[PDB]
Amino acid sequence: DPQLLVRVRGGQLRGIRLKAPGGPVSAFLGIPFAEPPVGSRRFMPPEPKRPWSGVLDATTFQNVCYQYVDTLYPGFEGTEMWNPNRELSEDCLYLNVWTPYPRPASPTPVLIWIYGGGFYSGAASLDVYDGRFLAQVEGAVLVSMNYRVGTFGFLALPGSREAPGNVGLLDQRLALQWVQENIAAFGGDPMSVTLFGESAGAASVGMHILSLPSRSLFHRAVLQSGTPNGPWATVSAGEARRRATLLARLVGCPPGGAGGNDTELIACLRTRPAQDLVDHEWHVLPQESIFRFSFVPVVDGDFLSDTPEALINTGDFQDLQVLVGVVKDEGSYFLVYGVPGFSKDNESLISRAQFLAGVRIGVPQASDLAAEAVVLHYTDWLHPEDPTHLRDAMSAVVGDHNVVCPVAQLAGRLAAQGARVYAYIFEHRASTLTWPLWMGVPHGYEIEFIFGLPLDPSLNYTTEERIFAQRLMKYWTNFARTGDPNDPRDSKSPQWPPYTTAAQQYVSLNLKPLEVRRGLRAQTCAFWNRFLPKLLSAT
Amino acid sequence: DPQLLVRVRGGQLRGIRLKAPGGPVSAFLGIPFAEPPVGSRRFMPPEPKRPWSGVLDATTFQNVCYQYVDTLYPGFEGTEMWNPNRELSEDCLYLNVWTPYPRPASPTPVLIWIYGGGFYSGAASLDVYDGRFLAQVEGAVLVSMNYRVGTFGFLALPGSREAPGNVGLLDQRLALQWVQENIAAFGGDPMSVTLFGESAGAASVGMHILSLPSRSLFHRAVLQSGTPNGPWATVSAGEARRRATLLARLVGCPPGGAGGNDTELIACLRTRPAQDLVDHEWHVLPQESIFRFSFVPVVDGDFLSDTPEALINTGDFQDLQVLVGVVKDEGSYFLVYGVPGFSKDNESLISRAQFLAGVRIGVPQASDLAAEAVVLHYTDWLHPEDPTHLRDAMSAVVGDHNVVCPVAQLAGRLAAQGARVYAYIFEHRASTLTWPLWMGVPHGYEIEFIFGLPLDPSLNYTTEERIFAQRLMKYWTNFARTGDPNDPRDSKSPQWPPYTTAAQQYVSLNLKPLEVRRGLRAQTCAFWNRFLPKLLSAT
C-alpha cells in the first residue's frame, strides 16, 4: 500500500493503518530522527540520523528516553498514565507521524506536539498523546517526537564542549528540522508548522520562540499550562554547574580528590549506567520543594541569549500568533508529592501550621519576609484556620506561582510586544478523572480533551465530553490553520477575542459555551509578577 | 425659676431655658471646672476651679481654647463649621450641661461629649455639638467640656515638672471628676457616665479607658471615627521633646546659644503671646504629611503606662461596653489639605504619579518598600491609571490607615479581651453636605445626626434624615442606658449584634434599616494591622 510506504530524505519507511472511530489513519511510528546519543554521545547535541538501506519499519512505538519512574501511588491510573509505556533506553530519539488515510490532497497544516514532565520525564508513546483523532477527524498531519529528559537531556557544565546543556531542546529542534525537510512527503505543509505542548513541553515551545534558530521551523505556537519564563523551567549556569558536579560526585565522578578537568568529569560520567544517574537526580536540588526540577534548560547565552524573562521582556514578537491557557487547579497535583498533610486518599483538610510550612516548600526561594507576604496574600483573615480554605490556598500558591501568573506574565508581555495572543481557562473536570475531587482540574487534565480521547467510545466519557472534545479540537486545528481558534468565516455564536494588555480578555474553556472574561488572576498575579520579585531582590 | 438655679459643689449657677422643637430644655453653659491655666499655669496640669460667691451666670457659651483657625476655604461652611465660634482665649476651661425642662425625676444617664480636631483645634461651643435635642427628646443629661488643644494642651518636655504633657487630657479628666461630684444636681446619674467623642475626642475617650485614674469616672464608652491606637493620636517622649524644643527655638526660646534648662525653656515659652506658638505649630512635623498632628498625647509612662498598642493588646477590658464605628469615606476630607491634585472645587481626577506621591504624604512613616506595598495593595492592575479609581484609592489609603483599620484593630482587641463591643459604618451622606460629591461621607459627617440636628425644622434636612436621626439618637441613648444600642425589650425588627473576633459583625448605619455585615475591611486591615508593621520594622 503506497499509503503506508513513504520515502524520507534518508530512506524508506513502512507505516501502519490505524482505525479511529471516524475512519482510517496512516501512522508512521518510530522514525529515527537522529543517531542514538549513546556511549560517547551522552550529554552531546544530537546528530542527524544516517540514511538507511531497505525499508525501515515504522509500524510501532519506540523506546522512551531514560528517566525516573513514578512510584508514589503504584497501580494508580492518575500517576501511572504519565509513566513510560515502552522500554527505557538512551536510544530513544524517534518521532511519530499520523496522517489521515488516505494522505491528504494538498499540504495540510502540521501540529508538532511536545510532551512535558518537568524536563525529567515524559514520552510521545503515551496514550493521551494519541494523534489519531486530530488527524482522523480534523484531517491534520500530527507529529510527536521524543527528546532526552533528565541528566541526559540537560545535565550541563556550561562552557564545556561535551555537556554544554539544553541538548534535550536541540533534540526537539532537530525533530523540527526534520519535519521541515520531510513532512511534505506525508502530505504536511512545511509552511504551516504549529508547535504545541503542555507543562515543560509548553515551556519548550516557549524556548523555541525565544531561540533564534528555532524560529524558521515553526509559524504558530500553543503553550498549555507552562511557559519559558517562570521559576522552574530554567536555571543559571552557576546552578547548573553546581548540580552537575554535585551529581557527578555522588556517582563517584571523578573518584578521589581529583578535579579541574571538566572533560575527565564528563568522561567519567559517560561510563556510569544510566540508572546510576537517575538514582541521584533528585539529590541536587538546593532546598526541600515542589514544582522544582533538577535538570532543565540552562541560560547558557547560546540556546537562550539571556533569561527568558529578559527575552519576553524585550523580544520582537510582532506577528507571532500564540494560543496560551491554564487549567482550573494547576497546583493541586504537586501537593501530594511533598506537602505534609496532603494525600490523594483523604480530603487533605490541612492545619494552619501545615499551610505555613507548605508555603516554604511551595516557594522555596522565598525569604521569610517574602513568605510572610505570600501568607498574607493567601490567608483568609476572617477564617485563618478553616482547613478547607487553607487547603485550596496551598494549591493556589503553587498553581499561581508556577503556572498561572507566569502564563499571564507571558501573555501580556507578548501582546504588548506585537504578538496576537489568545488565552483560556480549562475548567472541565473529566468524568473519568481518578484523582480525588479536591484536586478539581489538575495540571495536565486538558490533554485527554485536546487530543480527542473522548471520541473513542470504549474509553467512555460523556457525550457532552465528546462534543466538548470536538469543540476543543476545532479551536486548536483552527488556530493551527488560520491563527485564530474561531469558527472559520462561519461566525457561529460565541467569539474568542485576543488577549490584550488593556482589556485582558480570556475565555472559559468548558462544557458551557465560550464565556469571555477579563484579567487572569489580575491582583494575585500583580502580587507575584510585580511586587514579590522586588521583595525577594531586597531580601 | 429653681429649674434654672442650681447650687454646685463650688457655688450657685443660673442656667437659661432653651427651646428645642419637642419642648423646653434647661442649659447651663460656661461652668468653670478649673482655674484658668494662664500665665505661669500654661503647660500645667489643670487645677480645680475655686468656689465662687453669689450666683455664677451660666447662660452662655464661654471662650474657645487657643487654637489655629482654618483658612483654606474662607467663608465655606464645610470648613468654617469646625472653626471657633467664640473668642479665642487661654481662659477656656468650662463645660456645659443640658437637662430636660424640667429636671428629670430620677437619676438620668449622662452622655459626656468630647470634641475632636486633631488635638489641635475644636470646641464644645460648636453648633453640631448642641446637646439640646438628646436631652429634650431622649431625656438625657448631656455634658460637653472644653479641653486645651495644641501646644497649650500637649506641648511636652517629658519628665519636666512644668510641661509634662497630656494636660489637655487631664483637662477632660477634671471635667469628668466634676461631672462625678456635681452632675447629680442636674438630675444626672453619676453612676451611668457614658463618654462619647469623634476624631481625637474618640481617641481621647480611648485614652480614658487606657488610663487607670480615668476609669472610675465613666462606665460606658463610644468612639466615633477615631481610636487611641493608630498612627496619629500619640507620639513618643523623644519626638515630643524634639517638637517642643524645636517649637520653642523658633519662638526664640531660649534666646542665644543657651540651654540644658528645661525650666528656663518653659519659663521663656510661658511669656510668648499665645498666637506666637500657634504660628509655629505646624513647623515641627518631621515630614510632609496629612492626618498627622504636631501636639498630641504623649506616651509619658504616666497618663499612658505604655503605648496604646501595648495597652489594648494586654489590658483587661472584661466588662467594658463600647460602641465603635466609622464613616463611609474617612480619608476624603484630609486630601484637600495637602495632596497635589485634590480640591473641593473639581472632581480631583488625579494622575497616577500624583497618586504615587499621595501615598508618601498619606503614609509619611513608610519606607519605599512599604510604600510599594501600599501601592500594590490599592492599585487596580486592570486599570492602573483610571483617575477615578486612583482618586478613591488615595482617599482609602488615608481613611483606612488612620481611622478604619485602627478602629478594627481596637474592636477586635477589645472583644478578644472581654469587652462587649458593637460596631457600625455610617453611610448616609447628609443632603445638606456642602463638600463635593466625590468626598461622599467625610470624616465627621455623622455628628449632625447623632446630635439630632435634623430634628430642627429650620435647618431643613429630609424627613427621612429626621427619622434617621431619631433612630441614631435612640441607639446612642440606649447604649448609654443599657449598654446595648438595641430596642429595649421591644425586639423591634432588625437587631445589632456584638462585634466578635469570630463572626466580626458590624452594621450599616444608614437610611435603610440595620443590615448586619461581617469583617470591617478584613483583608485591607490585615494588610495594615498585621503585615505592614513588620515591613516597616524591617525597613
PDB file of N, CA, C and O in Angstrom, chain B residues 302-348:
ATOM      1  N   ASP B 302       2.863  57.585  82.345  1.00  0.00           N
ATOM      2  CA  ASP B 302       2.103  58.120  83.447  1.00  0.00           C
ATOM      3  C   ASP B 302       0.656  58.036  82.966  1.00  0.00           C
ATOM      4  O   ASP B 302      -0.023  57.022  83.081  1.00  0.00           O
ATOM      5  N   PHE B 303       0.248  59.122  82.293  1.00  0.00           N
ATOM      6  CA  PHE B 303      -1.153  59.048  81.854  1.00  0.00           C
ATOM      7  C   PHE B 303      -1.359  57.799  81.024  1.00  0.00           C
ATOM      8  O   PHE B 303      -2.438  57.236  81.194  1.00  0.00           O
ATOM      9  N   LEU B 304      -0.432  57.424  80.186  1.00  0.00           N
ATOM     10  CA  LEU B 304      -0.436  56.172  79.434  1.00  0.00           C
ATOM     11  C   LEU B 304       0.806  55.416  79.961  1.00  0.00           C
ATOM     12  O   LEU B 304       1.947  55.901  79.940  1.00  0.00           O
ATOM     13  N   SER B 305       0.634  54.217  80.539  1.00  0.00           N
ATOM     14  CA  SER B 305       1.770  53.495  81.138  1.00  0.00           C
ATOM     15  C   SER B 305       2.704  52.924  80.092  1.00  0.00           C
ATOM     16  O   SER B 305       3.855  52.591  80.359  1.00  0.00           O
ATOM     17  N   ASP B 306       2.135  52.802  78.911  1.00  0.00           N
ATOM     18  CA  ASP B 306       2.845  52.242  77.765  1.00  0.00           C
ATOM     19  C   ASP B 306       2.029  52.666  76.547  1.00  0.00           C
ATOM     20  O   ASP B 306       0.942  53.250  76.761  1.00  0.00           O
ATOM     21  N   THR B 307       2.487  52.379  75.359  1.00  0.00           N
ATOM     22  CA  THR B 307       1.705  52.718  74.195  1.00  0.00           C
ATOM     23  C   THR B 307       0.298  52.153  74.229  1.00  0.00           C
ATOM     24  O   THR B 307       0.112  50.985  74.610  1.00  0.00           O
ATOM     25  N   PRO B 308      -0.624  52.900  73.646  1.00  0.00           N
ATOM     26  CA  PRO B 308      -1.980  52.405  73.459  1.00  0.00           C
ATOM     27  C   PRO B 308      -1.899  51.026  72.796  1.00  0.00           C
ATOM     28  O   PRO B 308      -2.619  50.115  73.231  1.00  0.00           O
ATOM     29  N   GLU B 309      -1.042  50.823  71.778  1.00  0.00           N
ATOM     30  CA  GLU B 309      -0.970  49.476  71.175  1.00  0.00           C
ATOM     31  C   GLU B 309      -0.761  48.440  72.267  1.00  0.00           C
ATOM     32  O   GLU B 309      -1.656  47.649  72.526  1.00  0.00           O
ATOM     33  N   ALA B 310       0.380  48.507  72.950  1.00  0.00           N
ATOM     34  CA  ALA B 310       0.618  47.563  74.043  1.00  0.00           C
ATOM     35  C   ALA B 310      -0.572  47.514  74.984  1.00  0.00           C
ATOM     36  O   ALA B 310      -0.900  46.452  75.504  1.00  0.00           O
ATOM     37  N   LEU B 311      -1.197  48.650  75.288  1.00  0.00           N
ATOM     38  CA  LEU B 311      -2.293  48.619  76.254  1.00  0.00           C
ATOM     39  C   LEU B 311      -3.509  47.882  75.760  1.00  0.00           C
ATOM     40  O   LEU B 311      -3.915  46.936  76.436  1.00  0.00           O
ATOM     41  N   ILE B 312      -4.057  48.192  74.592  1.00  0.00           N
ATOM     42  CA  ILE B 312      -5.235  47.466  74.140  1.00  0.00           C
ATOM     43  C   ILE B 312      -4.843  46.015  73.847  1.00  0.00           C
ATOM     44  O   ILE B 312      -5.655  45.125  73.604  1.00  0.00           O
ATOM     45  N   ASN B 313      -3.538  45.810  73.751  1.00  0.00           N
ATOM     46  CA  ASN B 313      -3.071  44.461  73.470  1.00  0.00           C
ATOM     47  C   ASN B 313      -3.115  43.655  74.739  1.00  0.00           C
ATOM     48  O   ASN B 313      -3.468  42.476  74.619  1.00  0.00           O
ATOM     49  N   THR B 314      -2.788  44.160  75.916  1.00  0.00           N
ATOM     50  CA  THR B 314      -2.820  43.312  77.107  1.00  0.00           C
ATOM     51  C   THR B 314      -3.707  43.807  78.231  1.00  0.00           C
ATOM     52  O   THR B 314      -3.653  43.286  79.349  1.00  0.00           O
ATOM     53  N   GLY B 315      -4.523  44.817  77.969  1.00  0.00           N
ATOM     54  CA  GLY B 315      -5.389  45.368  79.009  1.00  0.00           C
ATOM     55  C   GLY B 315      -6.511  44.385  79.318  1.00  0.00           C
ATOM     56  O   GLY B 315      -6.804  43.534  78.494  1.00  0.00           O
ATOM     57  N   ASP B 316      -7.116  44.508  80.493  1.00  0.00           N
ATOM     58  CA  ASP B 316      -8.259  43.657  80.845  1.00  0.00           C
ATOM     59  C   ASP B 316      -9.504  44.532  80.633  1.00  0.00           C
ATOM     60  O   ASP B 316      -9.734  45.435  81.443  1.00  0.00           O
ATOM     61  N   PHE B 317     -10.234  44.305  79.551  1.00  0.00           N
ATOM     62  CA  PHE B 317     -11.422  45.135  79.290  1.00  0.00           C
ATOM     63  C   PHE B 317     -12.665  44.272  79.424  1.00  0.00           C
ATOM     64  O   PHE B 317     -13.668  44.482  78.739  1.00  0.00           O
ATOM     65  N   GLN B 318     -12.560  43.294  80.315  1.00  0.00           N
ATOM     66  CA  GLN B 318     -13.596  42.308  80.537  1.00  0.00           C
ATOM     67  C   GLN B 318     -14.821  42.753  81.282  1.00  0.00           C
ATOM     68  O   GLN B 318     -15.009  42.346  82.423  1.00  0.00           O
ATOM     69  N   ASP B 319     -15.650  43.595  80.697  1.00  0.00           N
ATOM     70  CA  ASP B 319     -16.853  44.139  81.295  1.00  0.00           C
ATOM     71  C   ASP B 319     -17.256  45.438  80.574  1.00  0.00           C
ATOM     72  O   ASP B 319     -18.440  45.773  80.483  1.00  0.00           O
ATOM     73  N   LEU B 320     -16.240  46.148  80.079  1.00  0.00           N
ATOM     74  CA  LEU B 320     -16.449  47.392  79.376  1.00  0.00           C
ATOM     75  C   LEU B 320     -17.432  47.290  78.223  1.00  0.00           C
ATOM     76  O   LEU B 320     -17.296  46.415  77.370  1.00  0.00           O
ATOM     77  N   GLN B 321     -18.415  48.169  78.152  1.00  0.00           N
ATOM     78  CA  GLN B 321     -19.307  48.130  76.986  1.00  0.00           C
ATOM     79  C   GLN B 321     -18.741  49.255  76.103  1.00  0.00           C
ATOM     80  O   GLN B 321     -18.436  50.313  76.658  1.00  0.00           O
ATOM     81  N   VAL B 322     -18.596  49.016  74.811  1.00  0.00           N
ATOM     82  CA  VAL B 322     -18.032  50.055  73.969  1.00  0.00           C
ATOM     83  C   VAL B 322     -18.706  50.036  72.602  1.00  0.00           C
ATOM     84  O   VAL B 322     -18.706  48.998  71.939  1.00  0.00           O
ATOM     85  N   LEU B 323     -19.205  51.157  72.177  1.00  0.00           N
ATOM     86  CA  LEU B 323     -19.773  51.243  70.820  1.00  0.00           C
ATOM     87  C   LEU B 323     -18.641  51.859  69.993  1.00  0.00           C
ATOM     88  O   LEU B 323     -17.905  52.738  70.506  1.00  0.00           O
ATOM     89  N   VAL B 324     -18.409  51.448  68.771  1.00  0.00           N
ATOM     90  CA  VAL B 324     -17.329  51.958  67.940  1.00  0.00           C
ATOM     91  C   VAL B 324     -17.808  52.029  66.504  1.00  0.00           C
ATOM     92  O   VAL B 324     -18.690  51.202  66.216  1.00  0.00           O
ATOM     93  N   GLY B 325     -17.286  52.887  65.647  1.00  0.00           N
ATOM     94  CA  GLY B 325     -17.801  52.840  64.275  1.00  0.00           C
ATOM     95  C   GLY B 325     -16.933  53.707  63.395  1.00  0.00           C
ATOM     96  O   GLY B 325     -15.847  54.105  63.829  1.00  0.00           O
ATOM     97  N   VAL B 326     -17.404  53.985  62.192  1.00  0.00           N
ATOM     98  CA  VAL B 326     -16.589  54.703  61.200  1.00  0.00           C
ATOM     99  C   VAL B 326     -17.503  55.214  60.095  1.00  0.00           C
ATOM    100  O   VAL B 326     -18.643  54.723  59.998  1.00  0.00           O
ATOM    101  N   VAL B 327     -17.069  56.139  59.265  1.00  0.00           N
ATOM    102  CA  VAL B 327     -17.943  56.613  58.203  1.00  0.00           C
ATOM    103  C   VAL B 327     -17.518  56.056  56.864  1.00  0.00           C
ATOM    104  O   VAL B 327     -16.464  55.420  56.715  1.00  0.00           O
ATOM    105  N   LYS B 328     -18.356  56.272  55.845  1.00  0.00           N
ATOM    106  CA  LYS B 328     -18.044  55.738  54.527  1.00  0.00           C
ATOM    107  C   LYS B 328     -16.659  56.164  54.051  1.00  0.00           C
ATOM    108  O   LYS B 328     -15.841  55.287  53.746  1.00  0.00           O
ATOM    109  N   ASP B 329     -16.361  57.457  53.970  1.00  0.00           N
ATOM    110  CA  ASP B 329     -15.059  57.872  53.490  1.00  0.00           C
ATOM    111  C   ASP B 329     -14.201  58.708  54.423  1.00  0.00           C
ATOM    112  O   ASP B 329     -13.939  59.860  54.071  1.00  0.00           O
ATOM    113  N   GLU B 330     -13.677  58.184  55.526  1.00  0.00           N
ATOM    114  CA  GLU B 330     -12.815  58.933  56.418  1.00  0.00           C
ATOM    115  C   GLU B 330     -11.787  59.799  55.686  1.00  0.00           C
ATOM    116  O   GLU B 330     -11.818  61.038  55.776  1.00  0.00           O
ATOM    117  N   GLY B 331     -10.883  59.203  54.919  1.00  0.00           N
ATOM    118  CA  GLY B 331      -9.861  59.902  54.236  1.00  0.00           C
ATOM    119  C   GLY B 331     -10.157  61.036  53.325  1.00  0.00           C
ATOM    120  O   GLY B 331      -9.234  61.863  53.109  1.00  0.00           O
ATOM    121  N   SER B 332     -11.317  61.170  52.713  1.00  0.00           N
ATOM    122  CA  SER B 332     -11.583  62.233  51.738  1.00  0.00           C
ATOM    123  C   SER B 332     -11.222  63.644  52.159  1.00  0.00           C
ATOM    124  O   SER B 332     -10.411  64.332  51.532  1.00  0.00           O
ATOM    125  N   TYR B 333     -11.842  64.124  53.236  1.00  0.00           N
ATOM    126  CA  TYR B 333     -11.610  65.470  53.794  1.00  0.00           C
ATOM    127  C   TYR B 333     -10.135  65.796  53.799  1.00  0.00           C
ATOM    128  O   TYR B 333      -9.714  66.763  53.162  1.00  0.00           O
ATOM    129  N   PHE B 334      -9.292  64.974  54.435  1.00  0.00           N
ATOM    130  CA  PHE B 334      -7.877  65.259  54.520  1.00  0.00           C
ATOM    131  C   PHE B 334      -7.145  65.413  53.225  1.00  0.00           C
ATOM    132  O   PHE B 334      -5.992  65.859  53.271  1.00  0.00           O
ATOM    133  N   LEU B 335      -7.703  64.982  52.104  1.00  0.00           N
ATOM    134  CA  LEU B 335      -6.903  65.055  50.880  1.00  0.00           C
ATOM    135  C   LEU B 335      -6.741  66.471  50.383  1.00  0.00           C
ATOM    136  O   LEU B 335      -5.675  66.848  49.890  1.00  0.00           O
ATOM    137  N   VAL B 336      -7.760  67.306  50.555  1.00  0.00           N
ATOM    138  CA  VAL B 336      -7.765  68.685  50.111  1.00  0.00           C
ATOM    139  C   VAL B 336      -6.663  69.490  50.786  1.00  0.00           C
ATOM    140  O   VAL B 336      -6.091  70.448  50.259  1.00  0.00           O
ATOM    141  N   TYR B 337      -6.345  69.101  52.015  1.00  0.00           N
ATOM    142  CA  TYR B 337      -5.337  69.768  52.810  1.00  0.00           C
ATOM    143  C   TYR B 337      -3.924  69.369  52.475  1.00  0.00           C
ATOM    144  O   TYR B 337      -3.106  69.205  53.411  1.00  0.00           O
ATOM    145  N   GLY B 338      -3.484  69.186  51.238  1.00  0.00           N
ATOM    146  CA  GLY B 338      -2.084  68.825  51.049  1.00  0.00           C
ATOM    147  C   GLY B 338      -1.742  67.755  50.047  1.00  0.00           C
ATOM    148  O   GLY B 338      -0.540  67.430  49.903  1.00  0.00           O
ATOM    149  N   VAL B 339      -2.696  67.156  49.331  1.00  0.00           N
ATOM    150  CA  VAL B 339      -2.313  66.136  48.355  1.00  0.00           C
ATOM    151  C   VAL B 339      -2.542  66.705  46.956  1.00  0.00           C
ATOM    152  O   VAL B 339      -3.669  66.878  46.493  1.00  0.00           O
ATOM    153  N   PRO B 340      -1.432  67.025  46.289  1.00  0.00           N
ATOM    154  CA  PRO B 340      -1.482  67.638  44.971  1.00  0.00           C
ATOM    155  C   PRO B 340      -2.443  66.888  44.070  1.00  0.00           C
ATOM    156  O   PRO B 340      -2.392  65.669  43.999  1.00  0.00           O
ATOM    157  N   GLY B 341      -3.337  67.630  43.430  1.00  0.00           N
ATOM    158  CA  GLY B 341      -4.355  67.101  42.549  1.00  0.00           C
ATOM    159  C   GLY B 341      -5.720  67.181  43.213  1.00  0.00           C
ATOM    160  O   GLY B 341      -6.754  67.140  42.526  1.00  0.00           O
ATOM    161  N   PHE B 342      -5.770  67.272  44.545  1.00  0.00           N
ATOM    162  CA  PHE B 342      -7.116  67.303  45.125  1.00  0.00           C
ATOM    163  C   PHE B 342      -7.592  68.702  45.455  1.00  0.00           C
ATOM    164  O   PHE B 342      -6.826  69.565  45.894  1.00  0.00           O
ATOM    165  N   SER B 343      -8.891  68.910  45.265  1.00  0.00           N
ATOM    166  CA  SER B 343      -9.532  70.164  45.613  1.00  0.00           C
ATOM    167  C   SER B 343     -11.020  69.905  45.857  1.00  0.00           C
ATOM    168  O   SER B 343     -11.593  68.963  45.305  1.00  0.00           O
ATOM    169  N   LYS B 344     -11.670  70.794  46.592  1.00  0.00           N
ATOM    170  CA  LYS B 344     -13.115  70.613  46.803  1.00  0.00           C
ATOM    171  C   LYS B 344     -13.842  71.176  45.578  1.00  0.00           C
ATOM    172  O   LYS B 344     -15.040  70.960  45.371  1.00  0.00           O
ATOM    173  N   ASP B 345     -13.101  71.931  44.774  1.00  0.00           N
ATOM    174  CA  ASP B 345     -13.696  72.600  43.639  1.00  0.00           C
ATOM    175  C   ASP B 345     -13.782  71.859  42.345  1.00  0.00           C
ATOM    176  O   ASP B 345     -14.631  72.265  41.516  1.00  0.00           O
ATOM    177  N   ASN B 346     -13.017  70.789  42.142  1.00  0.00           N
ATOM    178  CA  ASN B 346     -13.134  69.962  40.935  1.00  0.00           C
ATOM    179  C   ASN B 346     -13.290  68.514  41.399  1.00  0.00           C
ATOM    180  O   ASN B 346     -13.237  68.231  42.602  1.00  0.00           O
ATOM    181  N   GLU B 347     -13.416  67.581  40.475  1.00  0.00           N
ATOM    182  CA  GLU B 347     -13.615  66.167  40.765  1.00  0.00           C
ATOM    183  C   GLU B 347     -12.348  65.460  41.198  1.00  0.00           C
ATOM    184  O   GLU B 347     -12.339  64.261  41.521  1.00  0.00           O
ATOM    185  N   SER B 348     -11.245  66.210  41.204  1.00  0.00           N
ATOM    186  CA  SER B 348      -9.964  65.683  41.638  1.00  0.00           C
ATOM    187  C   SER B 348      -9.677  64.321  41.017  1.00  0.00           C
ATOM    188  O   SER B 348      -9.364  63.337  41.698  1.00  0.00           O
TER     189      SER B 348
END
